[model samples]
Target: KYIEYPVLQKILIGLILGAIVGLILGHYGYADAVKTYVKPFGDLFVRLLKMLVMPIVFASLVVGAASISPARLGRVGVKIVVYYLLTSAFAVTLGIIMARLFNPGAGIHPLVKILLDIVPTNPFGALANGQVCPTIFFAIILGIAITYLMNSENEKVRKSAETLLDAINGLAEAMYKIVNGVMQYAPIGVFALIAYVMAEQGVKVVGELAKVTAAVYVGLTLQILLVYFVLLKIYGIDPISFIKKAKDAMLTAFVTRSSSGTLPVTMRVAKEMGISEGIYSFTLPLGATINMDGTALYQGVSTFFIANALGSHLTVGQQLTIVLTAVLASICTAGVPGAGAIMLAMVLESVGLPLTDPNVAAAYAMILGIDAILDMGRTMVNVTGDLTGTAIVAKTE
Candidate 1:
């Protein structure tokens, strides 16, 4: 019976079913059952996805980066990083424009701490802590080092490098197998997670925050349609076909709100799209760690939303400062679970909207209620931004 439907359909069914069941429990006052019986399935599903993130990122990145000649690897790094920054800025700007238009009413430092965090104190701690930023730093260094050895004049050293590369190639393939196994549980996991979310915060709550949610979603929609679509066309890829292929990964991201959790599907979709593994493996993991175009827009819109709600006015200079803080914080704070909310708080504080003030605190609390909903949308585009960027870079390379 399970074999009859495609994976996408399975997940769609899960979302629909979970929402229906959630609504029932919330309405009937039996939501406690969700906590006792349902949340664990979702928790396990997310865990299964997370279990592979470190191994895949480490294995694929080493294998991918080691294969790319150093000079070209430099270009790939700069190209992707530049695109990430530009698009996130564009997204933040869009959020601001949308915020001002809709009056969403809203909107950091420790500047050194964020910069320092990128350089991990312990590579092992980075992997253990699931800090994808430092793990990326470590993987690239090891990859570059491996490439240097692969070209070593000494035959003995060269063979050892090849052998090690091959070993990691084997490990990367094994990680892919586990990725396939884990996705089988995705439909069930998505269901339980969404069910819990719905039971906990039902339709009534969404209605109260509908204005801001609509604003944030509009920014997310624009990011995909306007920003990413133009970038794809510039790269000579067909946006329609690209989205068709990317739909599965995006759906999983939407349901899970964890970009790292969605990478398994992102990897598979890249394979189907014929994106070189060198690009997808290296870039997607990096994207998960540093990319924040989607979150950037959320920051823009939320800043506006929060300010409007609190009756504060942000001047042009203040808005620019927010753009700066969000662009940096979104990248630096990314890959931590729940980065959007954290970045939003940072955005608030940089412009004097700190949550310590009671009015500001009340608005922040109200926004928190809808953060998960905003997260679902942002995570979807976060995955898309990575895919579209990878496809473009693959073609360029």
Candidate 2:
């Protein structure tokens, strides 16, 4: 019997242990120590992740897209797109339903401040506006067009396109190395981020909001265990078997907290799952661009949370609005920087909620703290969802 050295496992354990210690310190009023010395470590990790996103999406898309033949690629592309839309819609619905069940937002009144993000001072002014779907739409169109153009004809043009794509791909790989370089000190960052949140929320909120946290995770479970598994099973694919292969990539998504940052890992996962390089390359990148199941789910949860926090009851129509708005928001908000909260604001406005209420401000503040926490989980789900679709498509191919 040989004991294998599990680097990822070791790193993860360190992360968990450090987080726990930091939380205890926060509880005991050493929060400042943790915040000053520890939390920056995690922020740094996230920054490292962000640095990798754009180039990976661009190059991976061009490279992935180029590998697919026009015919089979087209068919698979349609299937993936259709699947992305439907599942996102369902993801929103899951959030709405779970919120209704748990009323997670209840007793929180910060729902209104989130509303003000909707009225852009100038549409282009908010070009990189976090959370607005329109901006994301613009980014996707640009990225896809560039990648598609790179896949073009004329030997010289093709050569130029390939060169550009390769440069971007190299840049993305460099970013990943940068991220890995930072992880050498990840424990410090994790400690700090967690300490700050815990200190600010009070160590008690962790215990207090255990149920709400559980609800969020429950929603995630429904999407992964229930939704993804059911779909795979319906198609006669084994869910556990598929997930076993995809676990490593999904783990990368969890820690990295950026779908874009997780591209290399995702590609590796797709290949290991026996996905054709053609589908893995194209579908995973496309999924990152268009498929945001995790964020969609989070949107659903946040909307319901806001509604609950306001102590204002939502009608079926309002709930439906959350579902519809969230679905649309996911597509429109394509990878906007800090887009989650801004997008949430847009959703609140869509449902006729006030955006500037005082309590809503507090909620936003709280949301800001927990967002990175939630994003880590959500991002992984996004990658997992993409791989699930890719594997399904791969089998058909």
Candidate 3:
């Protein structure tokens, strides 16, 4: 409370003010204006800034991993990666149980069961395609190489490698300066996005799927408390301060509904939390790319919501199938906005609720209609998972 986080404060106020404005406009038949004027800023946020995402992730990870021990990236790095997998697994399980209990279709469910696919076709190709797991792999491998080359046997090799490091560091530094300025406009960008989402996905669909929505929140809240809080507290980080530091990223993720989009703020929050860039620069980027705990939870609840609503009863084994599929596919899916809807399709198909049928497809569309409402919470959880895993591994390091 003593720390007046200006960005956090502004974005939150932006959300509240934006939400109110959106509701008013939605009700008054003025929502069309929101699409025209407001949504463009949100579009700029993801589409435009995302143009820089590749550079930031590539340069930052290359620098951070090389600057530190490559051994730790394996030791501590693997730990963070594993933490993401485990918590995502925990997320889906909690989602399944939460949805079953709530019975909202009663709605409501991670393991990387793909070590093979991490190898990139080529670094340039990975970046060009923006395929995350392979892209992160390229960064890690290059960092490992730079780490080795930094201590070269010949003076020329060592000196040139040092130049390479300097260039890479310059690249990362340049991007961060850009993000810092870009951040000044972020709260308003956040405001615009929320206004458009609210105006577009207003109260009616929320009312239609209220219980499923509530069930999804129940899943999200549980994952946040159980995974983030428990891990942070166990790792000796104070939960209160964690939230205080992390609120900006969390709220930004909530609005943007995209973990990748929230990275600028998330990285900023990590800096404020005193996490070393050598750590977060690698972990946060990787986590945003690979982790989908929130969406795993979303899948659990929404799977049941649609399945039960459509009169298809799922077995426990089938539910577990959903878990495995979701956890593995979570890595495969993009962390962009609306990723939850994509996972919903994958999860629903896992349990044989394929959208090939008109009835199932129609029900799927209903869930998609309220996806914005669900996306808000799930993306926050996704970013929280990233922060939580970053905290845990950084402590171990």
TM-score of each prediction? 0.87, 0.80, 0.85
Using TM-score, give the best candidate's number.
1
**Residue-wise lDDT of candidate 2 within 1-397, one digit each (tens)?**
2424343664576657766665576557566765566556666666665555555554555555555555675698688888999999988888777777876655644445434444455656664333333333443444455556655776677677667656766765676676556555554555455546655653226532554566677888878888887878887898788888778877766754556655666776666666665667677767775788878888877766666777767888778778777876676554533556667888888886676777876765666666756766777788787888877776776
Task: Using lDDT as the measure, name the better of candidate 1 and candidate 3.
Answer: 1
Which stretches of candidate 1 lie above 4 Å from their native place?
A: 1-5, 105-113, 202-208, 333-337, 358-361
**Ranking of all predicted structures according to TM-score, beginning with the best and ending with the worst:** 1, 3, 2
Cα lDDT listed for each candidate: 0.77, 0.66, 0.74
User: Worst 10-residue stretch by lDDT in candidate 1?
Assistant: 102-111
lDDT of 2 at 256: 44
Clashes of each: 14, 19, 9
Model 3 reaches what TM-score against the true structure?
Answer: 0.85
Best by lDDT: 1
